[PDB]
Design a protein around this ligand. Structure first.
Ligand SMILES: [Zn+2]
Ligand SMILES: [Zn+2]
Lengths: 73, 139, 927, 117
RNA sequence: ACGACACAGGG
RNA sequence: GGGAGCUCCUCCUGUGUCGU
């Protein structure tokens, strides 16, 4: 396949996971996540899209809800 | 005659509805755990040296505390749980995280006490609490 | 030259001025001034070559130039003496330039000259033309006018989008910097009319005979009478001037104490709502000689054309009065000694003050329909709520119904990973491919609802050219004559989706089924008869939309009350059903695109045009920026079908209900009530038809502006020249309605400008030769008309043009066209954007839609929509359809494999979806 | 058809008689009895009689310009600020609404005020 | 050809 | 009404099931 479509689908899934983790209960955080998601979906180059993916994944990882060791393995 | 075929069609249409109900209930229940598995499956499939370093750090313990900023002048802080996770992540004052070069400003301990970058050595390491939250800006 | 020097000395003459010879000692031949001429040979508002004036420019001390000229006409001797005599009477009026008639030997013998003094460079006609026929790449006169009168500077034009209304809304301030000049011109016009009347002068007041200071000249077509019996003709003047009265906010000085822009604002009484004598005073101050009756309250109008006229004047005058005096008018009502607060009237900006007729105090009980109309009334909801100051919007906010504000977010879509894996297994979504994912489910934060509501800042008070509007409306009525409408009873209403919401506050107790089951038939009939004598204001509830799209902008949808729909059905449903059942008309609503409907529509638009080209435009912010006058016009042409079942009062009260409920109702966004300035309502049944009316109106307006703005001396066809002459005559003369010429112009349009209209979406097949000669509308004409009548700038990069008819329209209803061979015949099939179909397949709005085996019909419908791609010359486009069929096959196979596993065994008519005969037959005529 | 009707009738009249008791007072009776014909616009009923104001402020400049202090002036009246909250419906203290403490709190802030006598 | 249900496309 | 997380909009078109 490609790399732009892959990161767009992955950003959709990131925002779904973050909505399930009740991030909408933080106006600032949810606004930042929504902006990163909408900016990934509209990007044309696969260089800044990976940067916004880094930011969104950092949002997901800075929590302590989703376990990251069983998921990785 | 036709009544038996009608009863057969009725049984079939009654079974293909309980099947749909069972599958719908199964998807409704198994969500929030299949979505996370799917996410990490398609994240390992991207194979980005920026996402992979973050994921490895997070599964080892070097987790951020705020959104990683993509601007040259912004500020970032992470959590260094072990000494080895510090000895290989940082050298001197240059921090390596998310495939970027960061420059440490201050390193607070678990009691909000500034510990100096010269005191963090292999010998005098185990006399701390070691959730050393470090702060840095990307260079 | 001694000749030129002596001519200059004589042109200055007595009034000490330092003049420089702009031009030479002969005529200057000014470059294309705008004129408003009507004689036996030409008629129209066009740009001609004025060539009988020897202009000069005046310089003050320091020897720099001023904006004051000495224009010296050189007409004949009889006209010289006539103008001299007519000027000797109006000489004492202050709204009259100096004239200084003299004779000077130019070519050897005493040519007579008329030298009016210190006028301006440009003329009110030039300002009106520049602002009406706005071309963004040839706007030199507008720029020079804005710079000359210190409204802005050239650096302001250095920026980009300086002319746009949506981008850079500071152009509104830059324009309003001309309002006091325009208003002083109006005052000078009224003074001149009074002087003409007191002197016994008869003549037409045209815009091209007045400075931008206001002074008047050119007494060539004036006739004498008995002193005191003069009569000036001011139809074309005021009519052409009206659209720029609200663009430049000319009546802003009327909001101040002594009608001067330095004193504070008038502190109007807060309990005041009538403002009738104020409107009469404004009319008698600025339009004293407009010789048609003006009714401030449109409840006294004589027909719907009178309603349009008086509502135009009211929408001008309502910008002077405080915005807290409009809306419902509440009153204290006692229900068994218990006091209520219910609306017993309404104060419209366009329709004036209207009072209900069935208002009863001191009632012992409330009936069911009285309970309904009191619960739908925002009076008791806003009277018992908290005051609200919402600093996030510039719109008016009434009250907060709750103690907390609601911040509603939108979710991201669900990823159908199975379909995406299947697609990328078939070779899709590669690097640099033809089809790419561009339609997603965009998420929104809490600040989306109110930030989308704030887009009503694009709705500005627009005063229309009424003499033009009340002819365009007759042409649109001719466009809507093949339909059958009227009122229907309560047992003739066909209500679908009876299990939806009933709006606010009725969604607290049940769905629409509850209120259609609790109300009898005679109860609904009584409610409908009530709405014909009383105004019921209602509340609509705005909430976000969860759908796939290509833009990251939030889209809100409105839900109107159950009273509004319940009565608007009985009012409009017969006509709506009739519009949606007619095949072969201009408004193609309810015409399917399957079984050959697309081909039939296209063959209908192409009907018989001579040199056919195709064209299509868009309306920027159509639902937000649509002026209220055009919405009232649409409502009036829709209600024109009730000429046998309703009287004048019934139709006016139905119009007032329509306005109060759909045009300027109270919007509940979150947990707070706001006032909506205007536009169309999403949850209204008649919005897609009002949009069609408005579309046809703008098209007819563009056509009349295209035909009236050409040099009639350059039209070679005698028929079209005479048609233009009679078009001007029927607009600005001929106050009555000429049905013969209306039919003639309608035939002209249908023959040379063929339309296919849906809700604000149109495709036009026009005569390209007539359009290149200026006899029918072009894209620039639509740009100009939208600029001066819609307060938006239509970018030419959103409009297309097709010079080959074998290629269909570029886009109609988001569908492309493609001439396909289908069994020895070549037909037009509509195909969608492949990214739209792929995105609908890949991203779903509910989690169980991802199972696949549960949603095979979802893919069958998507394949029905994606079939015509199989005829496209591009290969990925056909691969889309083949992919969908292969996925349907795989889905059925694994559904069978599961049904045989978890249950004992199962067995039918699904193989008809793996093969293209089904979807192919979906696109051919029946038999 | 006949039982849903009575239920919705009782519900509607209960809503009316509920929001009626929150409404009738001396302010409304005093502003209507000043009108020449008992008829007043609706847009001035909360502006003149409501005893509670809710201000929604998007920025810190708007807060500084509108509701600075514990008492401000709007619609020709003095309002007493109490219970200012943020977009998360969390209580915010007046000492925390600063120029440098502005990025640390969620916007918009919803200020509640009672009319002062 | 007429209603109910589900789905799909086009403010 | 069923369903979903106190709330779930309008118009048109077309499929697939059911019943006349
Ligand atoms: Zn009238
Ligand atoms: Zn009627």
């Amino acid at each position: 396949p490609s790399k732009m479509s892959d990161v767009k689908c992955t950003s959709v899934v990131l925002l779904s996971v973050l909505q399930q983790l009740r991030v909408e209960s933080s106006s600032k955080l949810w606004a930042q996540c929504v902006q990163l998601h909408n900016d990934i979906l509209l990007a044309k180059d696969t260089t800044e899209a990976f940067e916004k993916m880094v930011s969104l994944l950092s949002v997901l990882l800075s929590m302590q809800g989703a376990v990251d060791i069983n998921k990785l393995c | 005659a036709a009544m038996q075929r009608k009863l057969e069609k009725m049984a079939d249409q009654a079974m293909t509805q309980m099947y749909k109900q069972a599958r719908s209930e199964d998807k409704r229940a198994k969500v929030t755990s299949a979505m996370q598995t799917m996410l990490f499956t398609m994240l390992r499939k991207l194979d980005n040296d920026a996402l992979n370093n973050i994921i490895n750090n997070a599964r080892d313990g070097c987790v951020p505390l705020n959104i990683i900023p993509l601007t040259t002048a912004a500020k970032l802080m992470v959590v260094i749980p072990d000494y080895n996770t510090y000895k290989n992540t940082c050298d001197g004052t240059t921090f390596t995280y998310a495939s970027a070069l960061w420059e440490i400003q201050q390193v607070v301990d678990a009691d909000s006490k500034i510990v100096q970058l010269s005191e963090i050595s292999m010998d005098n390491s185990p006399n701390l609490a070691w959730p050393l939250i470090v702060t840095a800006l990307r260079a | 030259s001694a000749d030129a020097q002596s001519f200059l000395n004589r042109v200055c003459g007595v009034s000490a001025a330092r003049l420089t010879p702009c031009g030479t000692g002969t005529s200057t031949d000014v470059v294309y001034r705008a004129f408003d001429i009507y004689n036996d040979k030409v008629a129209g508002f066009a740009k001609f070559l004025k060539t009988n004036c020897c202009r000069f420019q005046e310089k003050d001390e320091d020897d720099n130039l001023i904006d004051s000229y000495f224009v010296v006409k050189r007409h004949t001797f009889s006209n010289y003496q006539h103008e001299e005599t007519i000027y000797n009477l109006l000489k004492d009026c202050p709204a009259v330039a100096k004239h200084d008639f003299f004779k000077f030997r130019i070519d050897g013998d005493m040519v007579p000259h008329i030298s009016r003094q210190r006028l301006t460079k440009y003329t009110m006609a030039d300002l009106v033309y520049a602002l009406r026929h706005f071309d963004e790449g040839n706007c030199d006169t507008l720029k020079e006018i804005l710079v000359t009168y210190n409204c802005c500077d050239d650096d302001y034009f250095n920026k980009k989008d300086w002319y746009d209304f949506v981008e850079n809304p500071d152009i509104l301030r830059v324009y309003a910097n001309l309002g006091e000049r325009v208003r002083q011109a109006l005052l000078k016009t009224v003074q001149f009319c009074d002087a003409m009347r007191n002197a016994g002068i008869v003549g037409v007041l045209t815009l091209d005979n007045q400075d931008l200071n206001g002074n008047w000249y050119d007494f060539g077509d004036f006739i004498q009478t008995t002193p005191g019996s003069g009569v000036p003709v001011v139809d074309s003047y005021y009519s052409l001037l009206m659209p720029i009265l609200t663009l430049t906010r000319a009546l802003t000085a009327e909001s101040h104490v002594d009608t001067d822009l330095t004193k504070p604002y008038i502190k109007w009484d807060l309990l005041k709502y009538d403002f009738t004598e104020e409107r009469l005073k404004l009319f008698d101050r600025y339009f004293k000689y407009w010789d048609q009756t003006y009714h401030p309250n449109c409840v006294n109008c004589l027909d719907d054309r009178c309603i349009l006229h008086c509502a135009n004047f009211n929408v001008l005058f309502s910008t002077v009065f405080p915005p807290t005096s409009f809306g419902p008018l509440v009153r204290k009502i006692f229900v068994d000694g218990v006091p209520f607060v219910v609306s017993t009237g309404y104060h419209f900006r366009e329709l004036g003050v209207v009072h209900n007729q069935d208002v009863n105090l001191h009632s012992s009980r409330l009936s069911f329909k009285e309970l309904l109309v009191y619960a739908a009334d925002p009076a008791m909801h806003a009277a018992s709520g908290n005051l609200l100051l919402d600093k996030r919007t510039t719109c008016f906010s009434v009250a907060a119904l709750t103690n907390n504000v609601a911040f509603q977010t939108v979710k991201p879509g669900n990823f159908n990973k199975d379909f995406y894996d299947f697609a990328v297994s078939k070779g899709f979504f590669k690097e640099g491919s033809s089809v790419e994912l561009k339609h997603f489910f965009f998420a929104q934060d809490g600040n989306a609802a109110i930030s989308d509501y704030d887009y009503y800042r694009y709705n500005l008070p627009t005063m229309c050219d009424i003499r033009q509007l009340l002819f365009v409306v007759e042409v649109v009525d001719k466009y809507f004559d093949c339909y059958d409408g009227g009122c229907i009873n309560a047992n003739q209403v066909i209500v679908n989706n009876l299990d939806k919401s009933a709006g606010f506050p009725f969604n607290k107790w049940g769905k629409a089924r509850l209120y259609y089951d609790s109300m009898s038939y005679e109860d609904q009939d009584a409610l409908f008869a009530y709405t014909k004598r009383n105004v019921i204001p209602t509340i609509t509830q705005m909430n976000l939309k969860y759908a796939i799209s290509a833009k990251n902008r939030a889209r809100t949808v409105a839900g109107v009350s159950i009273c509004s729909t319940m009565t608007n059905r009985q009012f409009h449903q017969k006509l709506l059903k009739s519009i949606a059942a007619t095949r072969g008309a201009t408004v193609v609503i309810g015409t399917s695109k399957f079984y050959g409907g697309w081909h039939n529509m296209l063959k209908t638009v192409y009907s018989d045009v001579e040199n056919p080209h195709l064209m299509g435009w868009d309306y920027p912010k159509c639902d937000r920026a649509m002026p209220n006058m055009l919405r009232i016009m649409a409502s009036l042409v829709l209600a024109r079908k009730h000429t046998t079942c309703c009287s004048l009062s019934h139709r006016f009260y139905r119009l007032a209900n329509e306005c109060a409920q759909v045009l300027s109702e109270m919007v509940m966004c979150g947990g707070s009530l706001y006032v909506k300035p205007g536009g169309t309502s999403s949850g209204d049944a008649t919005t897609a038809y009002a949009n069609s009316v408005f579309n046809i109106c703008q098209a007819v307006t563009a056509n009349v502006n295209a035909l009236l703005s050409t040099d009639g001396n350059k039209i070679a066809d005698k028929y079209v020249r005479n048609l233009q002459h009679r078009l001007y005559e029927c607009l600005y003369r001929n106050r009555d309605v000429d049905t013969d010429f209306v039919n003639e112009f309608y035939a002209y349009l249908r023959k040379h400008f063929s339309m296919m209209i849906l809700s604000d979406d149109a495709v036009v097949c026009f005569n390209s030769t007539y359009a290149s000669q200026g006899l029918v509308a072009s894209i620039k004409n639509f740009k100009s008309v939208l600029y001066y009548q819609n307060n938006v700038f239509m970018s030419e990069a959103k409009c297309w043009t097709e010079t080959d008819l074998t290629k269909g329209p570029h886009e109609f209803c988001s569908q492309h066209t493609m001439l396909v061979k289908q069994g020895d015949d070549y037909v037009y099939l509509p195909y969608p954007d492949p990214s739209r179909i792929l995105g609908a397949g890949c991203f779903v709005d509910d989690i169980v839609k991802t199972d696949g085996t549960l949603m095979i019909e979802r893919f069958v419908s998507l394949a029905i929509d994606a079939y015509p791609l199989t005829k496209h010359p591009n290969q990925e486009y056909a691969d889309v359809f083949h992919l969908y069929l292969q996925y349907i096959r795989k889905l059925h196979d694994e559904l069978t494999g599961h049904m045989l596993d978890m249950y004992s065994v199962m067995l039918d008519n699904t193989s008809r979806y793996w093969e293209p005969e089904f979807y192919e037959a979906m696109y051919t005529p029946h038999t």
